[PDB]
Amino acid sequence: SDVVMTQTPLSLPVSLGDQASISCRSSQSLVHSNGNTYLRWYLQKPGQSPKVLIYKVSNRVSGVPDRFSGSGSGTDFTLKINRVEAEDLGVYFCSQSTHVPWTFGGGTKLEKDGGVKLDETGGGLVQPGGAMKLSCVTSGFTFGHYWMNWVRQSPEKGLEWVAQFRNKPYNYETYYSDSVKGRFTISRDDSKSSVYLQMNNLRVEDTGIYYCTGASYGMEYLGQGTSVTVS
């Protein structure tokens, strides 16, 4: 039932100045009943956090050069990069947010912002069985019009969406990944423009960098992440 996002190729070697093309396919249509197709492309530079380059298939995040273009429809999507430069090098991910759970492709290795801020705190080291509360304080966007999420990253599983807390128009509904159901609880406070993640009964496999994200009208902003180690 979970939408599988498949990227090709896993690794894409290029020479500076060449054109690059990355494919992302979904296991089912990403066309939403509301008319939007919720497909994002991200770039993660080595050692840094993922940043959105393209949203709703083809919309370029302002600031991203015109050399980048997203295209496609339904289940078949493509990111094109003209005249590759050094700053473009890193891992590109696609993600779908039409269906819950939100899901990510496995990545392809190619080898401010209106004052928006999201700051994650609470990370650290705990032993299995332990608990930890992550907090995310935001500013620079009208929080009431955003769905807040927690997404995590590990070498073993890649990017994984784990929880969502919708806004008032969408009944403040919460959703969780099966991997954390019954253990993690996402909470939201509009007055403080903050979201929190209470993580109980932690396991080694919960180890990862945890990012808070704010999504609205197909766009998404992400924090720099906070590291959680369960050892």
Cβ neighbours of 226 (radius 10 Å): 20
- Residue 220 binding ligand FLU, by CB under 6 A: yes
Complex with ligand FLU: residue 130 or 140, whichever CB lies closer: 140
Taking CB under 6 A as the rule, which mask of x and - marks residues 150-189 in contact with ligand FLU?
Answer: ----------------------------------------
Residues 6+ apart with CB under 8 A from 133: 122, 196, 197, 198, 199
Taking CB under 6 A as the rule, which mask of x and - marks residues 111-150 in contact with ligand FLU?
Answer: ----------------------------------xxx---
Complex with ligand FLU: residue 167 or 207, whichever CB lies closer: 167
Cβ neighbours of 179 (radius 10 Å): 16
For 81, the token pair is 């990069």
Complex with ligand FLU: residue 37 or 207, whichever CB lies closer: 37
Least distance in Å: CB of 142 to ligand FLU? Answer: 10
Query: What SS3 class is residue 191?
Result: helix
For 195, the token pair is 């979201």
Residues 6+ apart with CB under 8 A from 58: 69, 70, 71
CB 163 within 8 A of CB 184: yes
Residue number of the CB closest to ligand FLU reads 97
| Binding-site member from 91, 215, 222, 230 for ligand FLU (CB under 6 A) | 215
Taking CB under 6 A as the rule, which mask of x and - marks residues 89-108 in contact with ligand FLU?
Answer: --------x-----------
- Residue 3 binding ligand FLU, by CB under 6 A: no
| Binding-site member from 21, 128, 190, 217 for ligand FLU (CB under 6 A) | 217
Characterise 104 by phi-psi region: left (phi > 0), alpha (psi -120 to 50), beta (else): beta
Complex with ligand FLU: residue 74 or 128, whichever CB lies closer: 74
Q: What angle do CA 43, 213, 178 make, to 5 degrees?
A: 100
| Beta pairing, strands 20-26 & 76-81 | antiparallel
Residue ranges binding ligand FLU (CB under 6 A): 32, 34, 36, 38, 97, 145-147, 215-218, 220
